[PDB]
Design a protein around this motif. Sequence first.
Motif, PDB file in Angstrom:
ATOM      1  N   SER A 191       0.811  -1.202   0.000  1.00 19.61           N
ATOM      2  CA  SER A 191       0.000   0.000   0.000  1.00 19.61           C
ATOM      3  C   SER A 191       0.857   1.270   0.000  1.00 19.61           C
ATOM      4  CB  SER A 191      -0.907  -0.034   1.223  1.00 19.61           C
ATOM      5  OG  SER A 191      -1.724  -1.198   1.197  1.00 19.61           O
ATOM      6  N   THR A 192       0.172   2.409  -0.053  1.00 22.17           N
ATOM      7  CA  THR A 192       0.801   3.721  -0.037  1.00 22.17           C
ATOM      8  C   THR A 192      -0.205   4.694   0.598  1.00 22.17           C
ATOM      9  OG1 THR A 192       1.524   5.509  -1.524  1.00 22.17           O
ATOM     10  CG2 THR A 192       0.041   3.802  -2.407  1.00 22.17           C
ATOM     11  N   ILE A 193       0.258   5.655   1.388  1.00 25.28           N
ATOM     12  CA  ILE A 193      -0.614   6.538   2.177  1.00 25.28           C
ATOM     13  C   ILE A 193      -0.610   7.937   1.569  1.00 25.28           C
ATOM     14  CG2 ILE A 193      -1.314   7.381   4.430  1.00 25.28           C
ATOM     15  CD1 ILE A 193      -1.304   4.627   4.725  1.00 25.28           C
ATOM     16  N   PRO A 194      -1.773   8.534   1.295  1.00 22.50           N
ATOM     17  CA  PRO A 194      -1.800   9.927   0.813  1.00 22.50           C
ATOM     18  C   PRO A 194      -1.236  10.866   1.872  1.00 22.50           C
ATOM     19  CG  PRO A 194      -3.904   8.845   0.428  1.00 22.50           C
ATOM     20  CD  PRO A 194      -3.126   7.951   1.341  1.00 22.50           C
ATOM     21  N   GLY A 195      -0.368  11.782   1.442  1.00 24.41           N
ATOM     22  CA  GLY A 195       0.264  12.714   2.347  1.00 24.41           C
ATOM     23  C   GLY A 195       1.582  12.228   2.912  1.00 24.41           C
ATOM     24  N   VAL A 196       1.840  10.921   2.865  1.00 25.65           N
ATOM     25  CA  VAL A 196       3.060  10.343   3.402  1.00 25.65           C
ATOM     26  C   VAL A 196       3.999  10.115   2.232  1.00 25.65           C
ATOM     27  CG1 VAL A 196       4.007   8.436   4.724  1.00 25.65           C
ATOM     28  CG2 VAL A 196       1.698   9.240   5.192  1.00 25.65           C
ATOM     29  N   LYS A 197       5.275  10.424   2.438  1.00 26.36           N
ATOM     30  CA  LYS A 197       6.274  10.249   1.394  1.00 26.36           C
ATOM     31  C   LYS A 197       6.668   8.790   1.249  1.00 26.36           C
ATOM     32  CE  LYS A 197      10.804  11.933   0.062  1.00 26.36           C
ATOM     33  NZ  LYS A 197      12.173  12.300   0.472  1.00 26.36           N
ATOM     34  N   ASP A 243       6.474   4.790   1.293  1.00 28.44           N
ATOM     35  CA  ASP A 243       5.546   3.686   1.106  1.00 28.44           C
ATOM     36  C   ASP A 243       5.559   2.796   2.341  1.00 28.44           C
ATOM     37  OD1 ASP A 243       7.764   1.364   0.425  1.00 28.44           O
ATOM     38  OD2 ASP A 243       8.288   3.290  -0.499  1.00 28.44           O
ATOM     39  N   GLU A 281       7.477  15.659  10.454  1.00 30.93           N
ATOM     40  CA  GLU A 281       8.256  14.455  10.226  1.00 30.93           C
ATOM     41  C   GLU A 281       8.137  13.581  11.457  1.00 30.93           C
ATOM     42  OE1 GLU A 281      12.218  15.719   9.164  1.00 30.93           O
ATOM     43  OE2 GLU A 281      11.455  16.823   7.398  1.00 30.93           O
ATOM     44  N   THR A 305       7.561  10.877   6.589  1.00 32.39           N
ATOM     45  CA  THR A 305       7.472  12.296   6.280  1.00 32.39           C
ATOM     46  C   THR A 305       6.046  12.607   5.834  1.00 32.39           C
ATOM     47  OG1 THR A 305       9.795  12.628   5.752  1.00 32.39           O
ATOM     48  CG2 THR A 305       8.241  14.049   4.672  1.00 32.39           C
ATOM     49  N   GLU A 326       2.971  15.510   4.845  1.00 26.50           N
ATOM     50  CA  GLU A 326       2.857  16.765   4.113  1.00 26.50           C
ATOM     51  C   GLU A 326       1.490  17.337   4.464  1.00 26.50           C
ATOM     52  OE1 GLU A 326       1.350  15.121   0.323  1.00 26.50           O
ATOM     53  OE2 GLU A 326       2.598  16.719  -0.550  1.00 26.50           O
ATOM     54  N   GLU A 327       1.243  18.603   4.108  1.00 26.34           N
ATOM     55  CA  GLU A 327      -0.036  19.215   4.455  1.00 26.34           C
ATOM     56  C   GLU A 327      -1.188  18.326   4.004  1.00 26.34           C
ATOM     57  OE1 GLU A 327      -1.193  23.006   6.441  1.00 26.34           O
ATOM     58  OE2 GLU A 327      -2.028  21.057   5.893  1.00 26.34           O
ATOM     59  N   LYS A 374       4.476  19.659  -3.532  1.00 23.95           N
ATOM     60  CA  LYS A 374       3.870  18.578  -2.772  1.00 23.95           C
ATOM     61  C   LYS A 374       4.693  17.305  -2.974  1.00 23.95           C
ATOM     62  CE  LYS A 374       1.354  20.097  -0.539  1.00 23.95           C
ATOM     63  NZ  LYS A 374       0.677  19.921   0.783  1.00 23.95           N
ATOM     64  N   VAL A 375       4.814  16.473  -1.930  1.00 26.10           N
ATOM     65  CA  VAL A 375       5.486  15.178  -2.059  1.00 26.10           C
ATOM     66  C   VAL A 375       4.668  14.098  -1.358  1.00 26.10           C
ATOM     67  CG1 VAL A 375       7.481  13.808  -1.403  1.00 26.10           C
ATOM     68  CG2 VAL A 375       7.775  16.062  -2.411  1.00 26.10           C
ATOM     69  N   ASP A 376       4.305  13.069  -2.108  1.00 24.82           N
ATOM     70  CA  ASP A 376       3.438  11.976  -1.698  1.00 24.82           C
ATOM     71  C   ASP A 376       4.043  10.637  -2.093  1.00 24.82           C
ATOM     72  OD1 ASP A 376       1.062  11.436  -0.315  1.00 24.82           O
ATOM     73  OD2 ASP A 376      -0.155  11.306  -2.149  1.00 24.82           O
ATOM     74  N   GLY A 377       3.470   9.567  -1.544  1.00 27.80           N
ATOM     75  CA  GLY A 377       3.809   8.252  -2.042  1.00 27.80           C
ATOM     76  C   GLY A 377       3.321   8.086  -3.470  1.00 27.80           C
ATOM     77  N   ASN A 378       2.145   8.660  -3.767  1.00 29.94           N
ATOM     78  CA  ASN A 378       1.490   8.578  -5.062  1.00 29.94           C
ATOM     79  C   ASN A 378       1.854   9.704  -6.027  1.00 29.94           C
ATOM     80  OD1 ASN A 378       0.142   6.468  -3.657  1.00 29.94           O
ATOM     81  ND2 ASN A 378      -1.529   7.804  -3.060  1.00 29.94           N
ATOM     82  N   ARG A 405       3.386   3.219  -9.177  1.00 32.34           N
ATOM     83  CA  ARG A 405       3.641   2.573  -7.891  1.00 32.34           C
ATOM     84  C   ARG A 405       3.279   1.100  -7.969  1.00 32.34           C
ATOM     85  NH1 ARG A 405       6.721   3.427  -4.075  1.00 32.34           N
ATOM     86  NH2 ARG A 405       6.776   5.501  -3.123  1.00 32.34           N
ATOM     87  N   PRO A 423       9.598   8.826  -4.461  1.00 35.32           N
ATOM     88  CA  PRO A 423       9.958  10.259  -4.374  1.00 35.32           C
ATOM     89  C   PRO A 423      11.288  10.466  -3.646  1.00 35.32           C
ATOM     90  CG  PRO A 423       8.228   9.689  -2.795  1.00 35.32           C
ATOM     91  CD  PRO A 423       8.387   8.505  -3.681  1.00 35.32           C
ATOM     92  N   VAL A 472       9.096  18.340   0.490  1.00 37.91           N
ATOM     93  CA  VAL A 472       8.261  19.516   0.230  1.00 37.91           C
ATOM     94  C   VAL A 472       9.089  20.779   0.400  1.00 37.91           C
ATOM     95  CG1 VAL A 472       6.083  20.630   0.683  1.00 37.91           C
ATOM     96  CG2 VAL A 472       6.286  18.197   1.112  1.00 37.91           C
TER      97      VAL A 472
END
Lengths: 176, 53, 84, 1111
Positions: A13-19, A21, A55, A78, A80-81, D598-602, D620, D634, D638
């Motif tokens: 999986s991967t989380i929105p907002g998280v850098k 995985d 972070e 990490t 993000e907003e 912006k920096v994301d997993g996606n 991904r 990534p 940010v």
Amino acid sequence: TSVYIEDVLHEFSTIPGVKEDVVEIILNLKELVVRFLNPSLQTVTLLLKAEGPKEVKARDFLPVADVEIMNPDLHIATLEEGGRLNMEVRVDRGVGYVPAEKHGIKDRINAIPVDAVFSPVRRVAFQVEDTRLGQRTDLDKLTLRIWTDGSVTPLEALNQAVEILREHLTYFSNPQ
Amino acid sequence: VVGPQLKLHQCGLPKRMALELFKPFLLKKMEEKGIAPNVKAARRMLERQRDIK
Amino acid sequence: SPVDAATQSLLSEELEKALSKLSEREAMVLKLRKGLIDGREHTLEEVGAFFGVTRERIRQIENKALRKLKYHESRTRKLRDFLD
Amino acid sequence: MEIKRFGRIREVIPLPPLTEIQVESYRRALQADVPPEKRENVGIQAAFRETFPIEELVLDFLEYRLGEPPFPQDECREKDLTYQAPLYARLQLIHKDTGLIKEDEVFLGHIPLMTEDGSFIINGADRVIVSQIHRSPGVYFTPDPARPGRYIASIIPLPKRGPWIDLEVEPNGVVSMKVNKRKFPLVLLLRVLGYDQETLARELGAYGELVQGLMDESVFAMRPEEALIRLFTLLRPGDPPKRDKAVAYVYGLIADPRRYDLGEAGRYKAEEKLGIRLSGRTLARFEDGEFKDEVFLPTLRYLFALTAGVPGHEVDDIDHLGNRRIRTVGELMTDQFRVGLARLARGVRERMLMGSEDSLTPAKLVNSRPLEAAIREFFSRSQLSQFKDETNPLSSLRHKRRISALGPGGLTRERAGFDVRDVHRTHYGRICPVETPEGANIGLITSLAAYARVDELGFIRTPYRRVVGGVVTDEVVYMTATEEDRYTIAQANTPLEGNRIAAERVVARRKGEPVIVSPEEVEFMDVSPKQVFSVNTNLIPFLEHDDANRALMGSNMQTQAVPLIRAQAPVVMTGLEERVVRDSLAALYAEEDGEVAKVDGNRIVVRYEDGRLVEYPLRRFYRSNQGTALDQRPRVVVGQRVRKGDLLADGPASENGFLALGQNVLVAIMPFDGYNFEDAIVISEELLKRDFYTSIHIERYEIEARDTKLGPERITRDIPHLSEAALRDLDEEGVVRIGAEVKPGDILVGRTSFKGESEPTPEERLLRSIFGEKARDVKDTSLRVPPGEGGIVVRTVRLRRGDPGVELKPGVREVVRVYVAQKRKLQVGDKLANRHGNKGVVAKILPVEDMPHLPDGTPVDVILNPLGVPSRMNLGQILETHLGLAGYFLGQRYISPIFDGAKEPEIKELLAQAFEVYFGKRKGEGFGVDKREVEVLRRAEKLGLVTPGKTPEEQLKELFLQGKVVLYDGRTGEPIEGPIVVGQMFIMKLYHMVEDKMHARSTGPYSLITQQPLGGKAQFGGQRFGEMEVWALEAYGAAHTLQEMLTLKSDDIEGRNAAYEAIIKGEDVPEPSVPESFRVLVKELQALALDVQTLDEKDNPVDIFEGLASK
RNA sequence: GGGG
DNA sequence: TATAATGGGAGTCTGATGC
DNA sequence: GCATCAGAGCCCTAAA
């Protein structure tokens, strides 16, 4: 030994907002050093909730009695907003190396089993140097260097090792 | 893969390979001791890998 | 397949070794009703002939054949696995 | 960490775009971005111009256009669609009998589009079109093997665009012409061209016995028309030699710029060789009612002067890379397009001679099926169209630059000999001498050299720097092999002071021949050592120290490296590992200067200077063709300030933009208790603990539900006679839930199918009656996990009929696809390799305490046996380890270019600086030399390794400069009796993994006709016990084992059934009966009307069909 | 087309 | 079932043995 | 002599 991340069904999986995985997140949770102050305690469960441009490090785990995080500076994720992180980590006491496939520990349905390096010992070296009692020569001076993660201390390790080795020699008692 | 510890007359054989190659033999033996009531039920148990005790 | 051939032999072998342990004869009335390698399934008409009794009675020993079979089966529950 | 780069060679030009052989070829073929009036006559355009106008009514070609793709690339891969553009053509119909003009734009179907990285998507799967090497069209002269003093002139056109011609000079003295394997005297053809005896005598004659031998009086006794009719009878025994019919045949074979095409490259080579100028690509013309020669007389003229010995006439080397050219994607596709166009033209002419000669437009006149089929046929079934190698980014990069001599218009294996497979002197700088397959294909499949580019004519060119006087300019000239042979070319490493050649004697080449030469004689100079080798070979550090046969394996195996989750770049690189990632297009870069929003997993959003907010989505965990995971991560945070071309995300097998095919491990070179034997490799359990050599793999499972004559297949959670335990992980609809662990035997997709007239047997009817349960209408056809597979369900796709946007192949109601992922930890049987060709399978995983360790407690990662080095002669791996040792303590990685690299003194300097860190730390920490270190030093000084009479620190340092250290056996604690080589090596986990290869079968599927087990793991096959295996059993005299192989374990049906029944009952297996494939042989010989009889000793027939075949 |  | 229609289109190298 | 024919290593994988 196990991780449940909210809105996550499995490791890939991967989380929105998280850098990071989830694979990397668990890779970071494998570096977490967790010391049990109470010797009778065999398992716990750490909680983490974070949001916003932060972070997350290991400090941010919600504190639990009789459990001290020896490396509170370790990076976890990490964010993000708008990034939201909510997890439950099951930490255990054990021996040796038990891979995730072996234990398959899941606190709930969506839990991800994690590879466990139980052993607190990071490195062991020993020096053997020449010495004398001034009457005799070619005597040995032995110096054991012991590095640990802090969950147990180099001295405690040395005593358990000696205690294991002594206990092993007992087995030679009853012949056949 | 090399097996230095083997005697000249031996080989390392993966257990999962051995279960298939000897499958008929294994079914009879699973009945003789008792791991399953009969031959037909024993085969059903090997089909799913988690049903293997 | 080898498995399938084996299974059919084993099913036939427990099927006859099951109709004789009640009695060969009430198993004989019933055996005539389905047919082992015959496929002797019709209904009320034809059954007029050789069972040993007249005609409504066989529709009962059929139930008694199936019922006696049913109790004895829970002990020798070996036919359960042939249900796939 | 620091990156220390070695080498003094200043490379004047960077590597060209590495996929340009693909990208530039196809862009040139389609010209989609060119406004039609400005298109040059090449590719698709040239094909149309060649096919049109279509004569009887005249159909003429105006222009074509390419539409936009109906679906984007991602969508095509998802839906099993070809990524393609609609092709339209504006055509005008003209009536030659009238004046009528009808114009329409007709739809010709779709043409497949190349993606940005040079590949294709054909039916949802990614494909590559491999370039094809072949003989350039032109006119060649080779010596006749039969007569040690005569020669043959060969006129060769483009493939399938004409016959091969041979001009042998026969023993009788007359010059003969060979066409389509038929021979006649060439004089006859000369007369047809309108030649008179005077012209041939006056033109040639200088050669006393040769020119007069071509003259034959009977042939001259007839005007050019009679000679044309006379020749046609010599070619078509049975076709009446009608004057218009004969002209038609000879014109189409020789003069037609439609049925005979010399190349554009053919035209240049012909003009250049014979010193003439061609008006077109044909051997002759039809002009002013007769034929006018172009090629034939100049070719005859050159042959006679050569037979004599006239200056300026040489034989041609047919393996020279000036005479061998590449057919790239564009050219290959365009050939098939031209074929498909010509077929459509047959349809046009046939439709213009039927259904009213008036009431027809161009739209009804054209059927595009022949064109669509030719293009679909090329992309799906051609031998040059291959399933993409995308194991790692380098795999596909290498695939696109491969060169094949086989395929439609080239050699076969059953038909290729040494000359073609050889490394020609002209391969220098053009085709890599290293990268070729081992085995039958050696030399047929090769790789484009790093600096090479294919020119417009198709000849491979390589760059050189001009040298004027002794000063080397920076102007670079790309040369063909023919043009390179003119000059004296100095080696790239020849010493320079500034721009001046600083040596009195330089190493140079003249026509490939190595020669020592003074700087006054130097015309050009090599750009770089990299230009001689392929991209894979250029990735091997210290290549100058590796025997070529092992370097070959090194190259090829990088192609097979699996992307690792922890993948790292090697600590010793060659400096190409950045470019490979960038040209591969796996990695993501910044378009202009900007700030990271912006920096994301996606995803990654970048705010540029333009003000535009650009969003780059990240691929991904996508499954490649070989099931390795292509996943982008990534690399920026940010708010990070980026410039143009800075790294944003890492692709697979890349680390911060450098190619990462493996991991850097601490290796000890030493035997270890036979677990190292014969290339086996011993590894530390520490590698699994820290997830080194762990890779993600995804397998795809698919199932269809279709309409049957017995009723619909349904995908359902309701499956007969199954417990809820078995169905637990299935959703409402019968599909396994996303995020479940599935193991062999588990249901992935539930499905039911309607039972055949096999409608349960009366035996089954009575059984079913006993349990109160009626036999169900449907049977369980569910999709299950195969033996040895399984993982976590990461995705499901369901496509029904009657859902927006989807229609399946006829009869198929619905399709379900399940993507299952697995994290593969390294295990025993997995294969590892380094870049020097050292390869081995993991035979033992020891616990960390058994691993050899340094005095300071550090255990090694890998133990490689030294016995692999001396016969293999790959020492680069050794130097790699030494420099790797220095870097482990110094905290550095190096760039050592090939052939301009780190040398021994330079490595020794680095090694000395490392010893201070490995040792000085200890002396300061309050520890002195070890007792065991003294014991090893004693033994080492007996070996001549250390100087006798020095302090232990001085001696250990002497050993450390040889890359050897004291090593303690973790089992004993005692030292290894000698100093051992230890250092950091780059090792890859290759794609060959036991999990994929382990297979076993008791019984399973059998073949229809032979009744023998099927083959292959995917079919649950049996192993082939072949002729040679049978021989082995015969030589052992194992008669019963062999008979079992031939009967009970194969096609003896009664036997195989009976043997299985015996084993499950505990009885011994019965004596076999006749193999069913022998019965097949008997019946097949009867179908040939041969009576085959099995007889007893009394010679009476024995019936092996047991009465079944006799009335 | 890869592996031995 | 009725103007008349009348001849086709297309592409390696070995060694052994019978005309 | 010259043409015509039938030969040209084994097991395995994946793609169709």
